Symmetry: D2
Subunit: 266 residues, 4 copies
């Protein structure tokens, strides 16, 4: 008699777990994650903000890179998230324990984070990670400010119900740089039509494409750098091929429409 199957680990491509040194994006904004997972550190006069953390096992690397930037663990004030899947919110619980940082997130992201990604609308229990609590619930368009730097939330539901873009204005060469950290717009293996767990999925994606098109943006970044044509491994050329918000939304919508037709076709 076959025994029940063993639990299966959430395994990812090696490049998602490949550490990199901090890569400067603008005067106060640094990529400090891995070659293929974004984790943005924004350094202010009154502490630092982290946008996403990658996989659960990246906690120590993130703290190492923070130290290279002059940021002690207790200097991390705030953690913001694109969406609460294991490869973007993975280390949040550990980071909170080791830094004292607060998490700000919308209600959808908060409830998914608090159950550690279990009972996912599409992935079941296959991508569970250590649960964490949100300390501040934010609404669409709400502004969170640290050290004078204002981060604005733009809800873009679809990839998860709580998917969020974050925008802020940094500087470079004395000129403002409007940064938009837009969430994933993929639907990998999702049932798009008539999904009982997400009945308005298609309507939400369509609205989210429009939301991304309209973001204030001189420089777009995404949780997976490849989704916006970044290449973190090539240093000062990393942003050279980066997409605009319009191009990112267009590419995602074309992919979505094609997937929708293939779902209709089996």
């Amino acid at each position: 008699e076959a025994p029940l199957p063993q639990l299966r680990a959430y395994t990812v491509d090696a490049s998602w777990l490949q550490p990199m040194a901090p890569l400067q994006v603008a005067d106060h904004t640094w990529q400090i994650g891995t070659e293929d997972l974004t984790a943005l550190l924004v350094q202010t006069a009154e502490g630092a903000v982290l946008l996403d953390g990658g996989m659960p096992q990246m906690a120590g690397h993130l703290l190492d890179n923070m130290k290279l930037r002059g940021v002690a663990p207790q200097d991390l004030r705030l953690i913001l998230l694109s969406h609460a899947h294991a490869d973007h919110a993975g280390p949040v619980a550990e980071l909170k324990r080791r830094t004292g940082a607060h998490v700000a997130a919308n209600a959808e992201t908060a409830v998914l984070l608090a159950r550690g990604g279990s009972n996912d609308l599409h992935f079941g229990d296959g991508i569970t990670y250590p649960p964490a609590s949100a300390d501040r619930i934010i609404m669409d368009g709400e502004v969170v400010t640290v050290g004078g730097i204002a981060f604005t939330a733009h809800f873009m539901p679809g990839h998860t119900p709580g998917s969020t873009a974050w925008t802020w204005t940094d500087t470079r060469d004395g000129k403002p740089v409007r940064i938009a950290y837009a969430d994933s717009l993929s639907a990998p293996g999702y049932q798009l039509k008539g999904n009982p767990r997400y009945p308005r999925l298609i309507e939400d994606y369509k609205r989210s494409f429009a939301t991304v098109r309209a973001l204030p943006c001189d420089l777009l970044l995404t949780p997976h750098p490849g989704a916006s044509n970044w290449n973190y491994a090539v240093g000062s050329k990393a942003s050279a091929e980066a997409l605009t918000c319009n191009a990112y939304a267009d590419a995602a919508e074309k992919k979505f429409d094609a997937q929708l037709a293939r779902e209709t076709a089996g």
Copy 2:
């Protein structure tokens, strides 16, 4: 450059995942888990009680065995736990979703369950499982009653801070049978002395040995059947070699004392 390691699944011996048909323990009490993980179903006139559920992937098997016993999913009223590690509380979240059952547990077990076993005092994040909430917090000696059957909690901290023995009186051949479901008394790989996360660990274990010795008991069962010398695979002979509470406590204390001396010896 080495990438960070992949996440590692919590894997167990195949016998822990080997389904078995329901095995009657007393007039209303059945073992419905696997060959090497206990999951007790107590069937009352007003619904059923489940004591432990085993590993996360056992949820469907438990519901199958409940159906064989005449217990529909919605007939499950209450889930009780020995301790909230992944191989005993694994399927609790799914069972709650599929049955509507409530969970009753002490505060220590409730907080560990709510973080899905993450940030374990000894095991870190290596044995995380889907988090679940406790619907009723119980105190030491508190009585929980379903369908007239009274279950009494006996706290026995050590293996986890929330480790609990549950006792109830069933029947067999018209005579009462005092059942004691006592938790694990092992300390596998634990730092026993001067543990900053559990400073009174040794004192708690020593008290818990005494608590187990004094339990009202005609028939002892344990989360791992082998710990009390049960053999679920041999049917009506399964209980033949079962230990008394005194023998179980004595064996565990001898093992603990020897481990303590080996820790002193490196």
Copy 3:
């Protein structure tokens, strides 16, 4: 020197706390709350559903009326909510403890319920009540079914971010009766414009008026019966003057637009 002020209780009009006997709305749907707070009991072959519970002190009255309807406490399967303010979700924690019912709610309602209505977007801590957990998170358009009766969620944010209308089809005289339990559309004392805690408040209300207009509805009910021109105290004439969904939405939008202009005017 003045001491700090005493805590102030959330007090309501006496009619909101005036018990009434069950009032039949359709073949399986009964008003079982007070003269001026709605609490709907829907009785199915496989248990009962409660939609809202009123104030915290109404828990015992609700159970009394359930018993008059033939519904024992353990027969209550599911609690649904319009929104998680103290005068509609007040007794949910106690009801869960005494009945074993599960709560299904969207993420916004779940987070507000879990903090007992504290840190309200508009009311601060003035309307706190005992916190409760949601056992099932639902999405817009999701169907929850008990005993074959399907309840559909329609999100209508504004009064709270989690405000929800629930629809189901009952019967009367052998004909179907599409019931719509639509949430409040009031904004009592709210700052509508440029509210930092709810930046898209006006956009959400405007969308919610349209959502209410389009609900499937032969019979509209509301958390406050007066909002839809019900009068629970007059028995079989209670529904005589009830508004349509279109009239309810129109009246609320006219009131909102007038309030918006008065806010512009001070």
Copy 4:
């Protein structure tokens, strides 16, 4: 027909709500609460610790007094609690929101805090306050360190299951001062014998008297200053009549034994 009663506010003696300026207890420890509720600020080189906060409406006063001491809101690192009743943990949720501080507490205190004091073992829902989450769960004897100052937890269950004494060593006149902040040992209106919600209440109190007697202590403080014969209103004479730990435990045990006999006598 009588309507259901209105909700009743938790009202306290005016002196419990009477603000006072900071009163120095030792080189780094200050009383910053009210005349009759203790709230201790311990100031370190790496941030401040708050032990208790008093009533919910004291949040602003506490922040005012912190500012007088040179402690900005974001300088508050850690909140510790004696027990999670409304008059000691009242403002914790607001303080967390306004300061970013973490809360460390044992599991019993954490679960009571997370339900805002509702469903109290003895007081029902009469003393509910805004819920808050614990960020770190601590065990008996565990050491929490901020800025080099070590705070040790001593569990003393009875008044609440999670009641805790905290000890640390400060200085004065170049000599060490062992401070013990011991919790309440009262049982106001409690059913002591055969309490189904707290079956081992008497055993826990008796053990807690012994725990308090054995605390390392040169200077005892208590959540209610009068319980240890402090008088915060008389400035530099405030500690003159303060009890020893032995005298505090003796007085509480005599009161408990007398109450136990009166309960036996009706």
